Amino acid sequence: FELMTHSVSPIGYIRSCFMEKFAIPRQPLLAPAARGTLELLPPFDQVEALEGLEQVSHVWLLFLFHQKPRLKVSLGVFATRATHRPNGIGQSVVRLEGFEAGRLWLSGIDLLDGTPVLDIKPYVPYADAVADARNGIADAPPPGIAVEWSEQARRQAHEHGQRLRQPVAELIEQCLAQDPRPPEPGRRYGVRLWDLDVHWHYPRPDLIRVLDVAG
Amino acid sequence: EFELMTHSVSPIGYIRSCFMEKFAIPRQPLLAPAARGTLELLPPFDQVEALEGLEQVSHVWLLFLFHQAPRSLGVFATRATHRPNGIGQSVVRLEGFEAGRLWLSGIDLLDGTPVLDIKPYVPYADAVADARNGIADAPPPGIAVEWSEQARRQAHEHGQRLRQPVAELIEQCLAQDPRPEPGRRYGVRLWDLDVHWHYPRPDLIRVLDVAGG
């Protein structure tokens, strides 16, 4: 009964460190160790589709959420970046580390592994960084929590980083500093990153301690 | 494994805009505050609960269909209007809203544009002021604009009729240099108007006529 419909299809799929949404940092560009790639599908896998991206540090990705919801509990859905929304499309700005035919290298990523992507465009500050903009309902995130390491977890993060060819220790630190759950002394918490299970607890309300890294 | 996934989208509403044609739409629309329009929402997205909280939000992202519909030359290195999935994104100033309608300014969308989504602009997440980009995405340098007395009077009378900032919009679009030969006349539609101008000098636009009704 809709007056108009339009079909979209992914140009590619995200491979990334993130397996669950609550682990994704609220300020992902401050977690550069959160890395991923955009694997492009034909006919978009030739290098000509990307020519000019050498001059661009950041890109917009439009993508599909893994989804009639109008109220979030209460704010209107259009007053939020909630993930269950009309038409199911999200947007994110990510640092472009580099590219080759069929692949973008990304950092500071905030997308789940497997995310279907619909579009890539350059981020352009004069148009996109709006200095006069104000938003009183989006609380900017807390300053960030200190992270210490058990000796075992430091060794395990190193070993798995060497296996994965990823900055695992830095990712863990950058992810945990922004608080990935949902707090209680003693309780062991966990989060998945790449093919790892990372466990931690709160020795004090303002300190996280990494206990172990397994996988 | 080898069948491309599909996903259907349908507009939540349609733009009513000052802009009827692509020519002269400002490349830096946030410096054209007189570029006004509305987003008319369709049920069930016209219910006021869907907007609760936007009173605290100065700017919104609109996702939209390039409704006028090839791999700065690769398509993914451009903000061109022909994109593989036909979806655009722009940020606009939210002037206000009520049930079923958003009032917008600084827009660059064509009249009739179908909109898929509205998102609040969130500065800590969306403003990367340090980001780098190529020369094809540099802002427009600007050009001087003068007015014939006739065009000044006509813009004023048409602005009163339409209850729109006609003279300001014309100046704000032409100052970004919609670009040229002095004898040629160029024009554009705005609302129900046709506006004409020329270049008496390479560094000067002069507005000649504002017609409509």
TrEMBL record, chain A:
Organism: Pseudomonas aeruginosa
Keyword set includes Hydrolase: no
Top EC class, one word: transferase
Superkingdom assignment: Bacteria
Protein name: tRNA (Adenine(37)-N6)-methyltransferase
CDD domains membership: UPF0066
Native organism taxonomy: Bacteria, Pseudomonadati, Pseudomonadota, Gammaproteobacteria, Pseudomonadales
All residue ranges annotated as the TsaA-like domain in the record: 8-132
Record-linked Pfam families: TrmO_C, TrmO_N
TM region positions: none
Enzyme Commission identifier(s): 2.1.1.-
Alphabetized UniProt keyword annotations: Methyltransferase, S-adenosyl-L-methionine, Transferase
Family: Belongs to the tRNA methyltransferase O family.
Gene Ontology MF term list: tRNA (L-threonylcarbamoyladenosine(37)-C2) methyltransferase activity
GO biological process: methylation
Keyword Repeat among record annotations: no
UniProtKB/TrEMBL annotation, chain B:
Segments crossing the lipid bilayer: none
Ranges in coiled-coil conformation: none
PROSITE patterns to which the protein is assigned, alphabetical: TSAA_1 (PS01318), TSAA_2 (PS51668)
The protein's enzyme class: transferase
GO BP terms: methylation
Domain of life according to the entry: Bacteria
EC number: 2.1.1.-
Keyword Transferase belongs to the record: yes
Keywords associated with the record: Methyltransferase, S-adenosyl-L-methionine, Transferase
Protein family per UniProt: Belongs to the tRNA methyltransferase O family.
The protein's name in its UniProt record: tRNA (Adenine(37)-N6)-methyltransferase
